[PDB]
Amino acid sequence: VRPLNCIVAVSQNMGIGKNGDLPWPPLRNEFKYFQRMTTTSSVEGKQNLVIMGRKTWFSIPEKNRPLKDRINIVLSRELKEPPRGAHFLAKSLDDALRLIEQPELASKVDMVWIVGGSSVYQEAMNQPGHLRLFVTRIMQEFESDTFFPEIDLGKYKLLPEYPGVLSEVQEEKGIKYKFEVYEKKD
Numbered sequence: 001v002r003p004l005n006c007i008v009a010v011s012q013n014m015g016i017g018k019n020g021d022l023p024w025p026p027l028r029n030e031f032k033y034f035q036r037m038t039t040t041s042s043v044e045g046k047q048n049l050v051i052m053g054r055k056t057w058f059s060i061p062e063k064n065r066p067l068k069d070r071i072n073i074v075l076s077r078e079l080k081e082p083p084r085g086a087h088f089l090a091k092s093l094d095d096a097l098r099l100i101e102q103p104e105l106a107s108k109v110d111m112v113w114i115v116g117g118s119s120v121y122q123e124a125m126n127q128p129g130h131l132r133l134f135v136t137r138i139m140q141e142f143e144s145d146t147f148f149p150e151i152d153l154g155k156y157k158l159l160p161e162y163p164g165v166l167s168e169v170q171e172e173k174g175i176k177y178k179f180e181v182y183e184k185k186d
């Protein structure tokens, strides 16, 4: 409910998006890691919470919205009411982060996950204080529209291991990938 955890899958060229969809064919095994990491709270009785941009929200297949068993917040400067299925709408990341720390949500919310928007990731990574980057390195180039911000290695430590994260190279449909975790304290 206070460290911010970004989670992203990125191609070798830092691509995250193409024509409102993913640059690569569906990687169902990588999506399982995304689901497990974002959904698993550390506390029974609390849910994790996901914050996303409006484009990312409408890019999720409808049959999969809201991201089930997570509290879903959508950021939009133009919507007046939350999208159908979304739990909260906020007009800024700052509004979202203030909401999450309200006492009425304390009993309710465990981990906070930033799940995209390029500009949502950008803003999250501008924040002072405790950040983690859960980065899936897709070890291939793909034609891309939208990109992940540079990861400053002076600022983010690459953790040698992280609980519940396997470090071996994975592969699906001939596409190799691996899970990394970065951390910026303070």
Ligand SMILES: NC(=O)C1=CN([C@@H]2O[C@H](COP(=O)(O)OP(=O)(O)OC[C@H]3O[C@@H](n4cnc5c(N)ncnc54)[C@@H](OP(=O)(O)O)[C@@H]3O)[C@@H](O)[C@H]2O)C=CC1
Pocket: 007, 008, 009, 010, 015, 016, 017, 018, 019, 020, 021, 022, 052, 053, 054, 055, 056, 057, 059, 075, 076, 077, 078, 079, 090, 091, 092, 093, 115, 116, 117, 118, 119, 120, 123, 145, 146
């Ligand atoms: N590989 C990966 O890990 C991921 C890939 N993607 C891909 O990325 C693409 C979508 O991402 P992207 O195009 O960057 O768009 P976003 O999901 O970041 O959505 C952009 C929109 O979200 C709102 N928004 C963003 N930031 C703020 C803010 N600070 N305050 C208020 N509103 C905000 C929109 O508002 P408005 O209604 O005001 O226009 C803005 O136009 C798709 O191709 C998707 O498939 C998405 C997530 C993860």
